[PDB]
Ligand binder design. Sequence first.
Ligand code: HEM
Ligand code: HEM
Ligand code: HEM
Ligand code: K
Ligand code: K
Lengths: 156, 157, 155, 155, 155, 155, 155
Amino acid sequence: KGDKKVIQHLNKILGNELIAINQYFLHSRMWNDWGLKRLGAHEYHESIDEMKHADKLIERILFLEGLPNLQDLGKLLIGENTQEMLQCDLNLELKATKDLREAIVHCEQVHDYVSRDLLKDILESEEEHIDYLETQLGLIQKVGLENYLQSHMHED
Amino acid sequence: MKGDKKVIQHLNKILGNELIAINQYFLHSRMWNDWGLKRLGAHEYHESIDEMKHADKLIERILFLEGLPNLQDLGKLLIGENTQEMLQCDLNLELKATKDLREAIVHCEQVHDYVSRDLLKDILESEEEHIDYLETQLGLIQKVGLENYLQSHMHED
Amino acid sequence: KGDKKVIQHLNKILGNELIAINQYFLHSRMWNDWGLKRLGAHEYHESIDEMKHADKLIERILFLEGLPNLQDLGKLLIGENTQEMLQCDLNLELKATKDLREAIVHCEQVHDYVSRDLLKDILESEEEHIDYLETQLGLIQKVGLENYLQSHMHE
Amino acid sequence: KGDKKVIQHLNKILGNELIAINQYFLHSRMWNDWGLKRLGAHEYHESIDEMKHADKLIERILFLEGLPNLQDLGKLLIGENTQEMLQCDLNLELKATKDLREAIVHCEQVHDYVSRDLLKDILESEEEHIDYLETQLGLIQKVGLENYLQSHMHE
Amino acid sequence: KGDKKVIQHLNKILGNELIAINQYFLHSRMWNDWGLKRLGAHEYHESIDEMKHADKLIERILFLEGLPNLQDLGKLLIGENTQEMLQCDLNLELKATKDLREAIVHCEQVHDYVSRDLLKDILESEEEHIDYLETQLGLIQKVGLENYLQSHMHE
Amino acid sequence: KGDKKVIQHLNKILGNELIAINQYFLHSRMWNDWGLKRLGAHEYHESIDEMKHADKLIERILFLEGLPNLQDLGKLLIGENTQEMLQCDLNLELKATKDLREAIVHCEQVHDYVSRDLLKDILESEEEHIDYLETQLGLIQKVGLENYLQSHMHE
Amino acid sequence: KGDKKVIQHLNKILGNELIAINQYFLHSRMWNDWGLKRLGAHEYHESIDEMKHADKLIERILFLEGLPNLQDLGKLLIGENTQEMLQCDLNLELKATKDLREAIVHCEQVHDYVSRDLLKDILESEEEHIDYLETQLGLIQKVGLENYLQSHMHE
Ligand code: HEM
Ligand code: HEM
Ligand code: HEM
Ligand SMILES: [K+]
Ligand SMILES: [K+]
């Protein structure tokens, strides 16, 4: 019933969300470990958001009578300090966003407009995340790394 | 520096088992929902959430002990194709998890990591509760027949 | 001081309650084990009711100056499946109820009208239990074993 | 699923709990009969606690695929006055505690860590009871028997 | 029209209530006089309860078309210290309870089941009071009279 | 009666807690003096936590019929600046935690599973304390000492 | 900077409070162990009060640029029964109170009127403590030791 390449696209986006869930979750727990609790909580909330996207992808694939793939897990990008963690998340999101545009082009072409609408809602969320990530990296330049980390020791 | 290395390897192994379980239970949940078996869908969803909570505690402990949590390696999901197989797959998964937990606890005891032991014991209790639930559902399928069992799980509450 | 045979009757009724406590408590936990939670909860309340009747019997025996006998525990009738368990409970209650009638006769004869009244209240409760049991057995015939068990999975 | 000697240990601890349930329940009603209502209420809660321990044991045994034994009831130690009743409870709890330790040794050996944990929680609660018991007997010595009883007349 | 001998029995139980009202009332105010206020309050409440039994007997006699007798007051057993006051109440209750069993035999025999039920409720109450009285006498022995009285100074 | 070596081990853990109580309290008060109020409040909570541990140890020793030793006070590790204070706290907890492991091995050996459980709960809280301390020292490196102290001026 | 001798005196009072904290805490816990819960609770409150005094002394020393001494712990006076425990507490407070007077004279002399005021507040609370202690010892004589202990069993 679903278009076969729409389902391949939905699984591919799903594969991206599955990487992100784990990467964000680890980076969150690394920040907590280091006592940078505000970064930790924020990253924890990014990880939950990716879990909610994966749910919606999984529900759609199953309705389209595809088989969701949660077995393949691509490469986690894990940073070694706060700057690299944030850059690692940004590299993940730039790739996820590219795959999202490509999935949407194809849904349009086979008139799977509901799948298209779902991917656009994810894409808007991923662009907000890009903005958060770029912004954090800019603040590191503007206030200095030590100040930036200080401002993230204590939770909101 | 602080953690025993084999404790860490044990913890990453349990964590690996939790990560399979998260994905397996989450897909079985959504498969059950897709079929309109909503009470099963919701119960399996809560099993998946509980495994996510246990992964979180293991990750925090690994990191305290100065090890590196492994979330990169995902072992084999046991995906069933109908209700009876999905339950059995979950049970086969738990029986392996539970064996692994016992071996870890043995080792924690040996090297005096009594806090890690205690965490693993709480997870074990919780996995043994799951085994009870799983075995009970399979026994009920026998006692009330599959059609009734499935009917009793169409609606939530 | 109570009539000595009244006390022996009170101790016999208590002996029956003590069997029922343990038999119903085990049947309750067997049903919970099997995922038949409504049967398990009902059977648990029947066990608690037998505990309360044992308590009244103990209090009365002590007031009458007798020795409550909590030591001798008779035979538990344990079933291996739902129909057997309900039938065992019924067999137990049919025996308890005969003992209650015999005891009441004796309290009447020696003018122990308070013990009689106490035993009549337990008898009413036991007859309502017989009714519940006979009814479950009937429902099993009417709706079929698998339906009947299905109806007792969720609390 | 269960290890067979784990199950025998669980049934033995269960057996000890069945004795304590009855012994404390009777001691409770005996204190009440005498108008020592505060000892009565205390002992009633000790009995209820042992009922909850038995429940947890039954459920564990059934999950491990054993047969809970509620049929065998060992010897109740019943005292004839307050000093002896407290000593009988203490002697019962010293033996309980010893069996709980041997059972935990065995769970540990065959890696039944959940059964071990359950028995350790029971043990903590039996050691609290030993403390209450030892303490009442020391109070009998410190304040005198008549005072001690007087302090236990009113709830 | 009631049975004649039913009515005679009801008026007899009523005379026992009228003695008891006045004896418990006086014992209460003697206790209050001495500053044993807990005994005084408890005894007040026993007196009020006898008043309520008397009222039920009066109503029933009048419904059966008899004449209630409140003129013939029997012998009050008034003690001169706590121990005697309590034994007096208990001597009065043993008699009351015996007259009660007789009335009930007679009601059974002429089929006055409602009068019988009324007398049985009173008998249960009178047996509770026997329990209280025997308990108190027991306590004086176990805790010593001085302690027993001290425990009844404050309400 | 407890095992003699368990009481020595409990007394040794107690000894460690008595040192920590005083060392944490003084560091707390030194932080408040310098106007580093958040550090002062955190450290006061740590000192309070050790006071609670000490209390449980004391209750347990006495139950076991031992004599709690509150007389021997070991050596306080008092730093003179924030970095040294934190490291002295960590040096203390490293020793405390080693001693707790050795106690727990002995308790397991002689089957004192309640003592073991108590010590394990204290160990888990001491380990959480080590985490806090290692984390703050690391934050000093990541944010710089001046920013780290500034972040602990206000509560 | 405070006067050097005032800091020595504050450190000496502090020293007394550290002894009292531990001595009162242990007596508290010994009373709870024996089931004299009211004495145990009162004594715990006394130990807490000394902890608050110690805190104020510590804050004041540091303000005055001195070094609080929490390392030297003088000699605990631990009794072995209730009467001795009370007298050991009074023996402690008699010394503490003498030392506080000598401190206050010195503070007055060098014009440290805030220190003096702090010490006077501690002296008033130590004097209230002496009153409590002398009162309990007198009550032991007036009511007898058995009644006195009985009056302190329940909180
Ligand atoms: C590293 C693997 C994962 C970890 C460590 C993890 C952890 C967590 C935690 C701690 C929570 C909050 C649980 C609570 O306390 O209520 C949560 C929620 C949730 N998770 Fe995961 N999770 C993981 C993977 C997944 C995956 C693969 C999915 C795929 C569907 C998923 C779906 C969800 C959903 C839907 C929620 C509820 C979110 C909400 O609405 O609040 N999670 N997870
Ligand atoms: C196999 C032996 C027994 C078991 C397993 C058992 C189990 C239980 C349980 C689980 C409860 C509820 C307690 C709570 O959580 O609050 C209870 C209550 C109680 N039991 Fe038992 N019980 C047993 C025997 C007895 C016996 C022999 C007596 C005799 C008097 C008794 C008298 C009572 C009473 C009066 C209550 C409170 C009932 C109420 O709610 O009014 N029990 N029991
Ligand atoms: C220099 C030594 C000590 C200092 C400065 C100190 C100070 C304090 C303070 C200020 C409090 C809070 C009191 C309140 O606000 O009501 C407290 C509470 C407490 N202290 Fe200590 N104390 C000391 C020694 C001890 C010791 C040796 C013990 C051993 C048992 C102890 C046991 C406790 C307990 C159980 C509490 C109540 C904690 C709670 O809230 O649960 N104290 N202490
Ligand atoms: K700054
Ligand atoms: K007295």
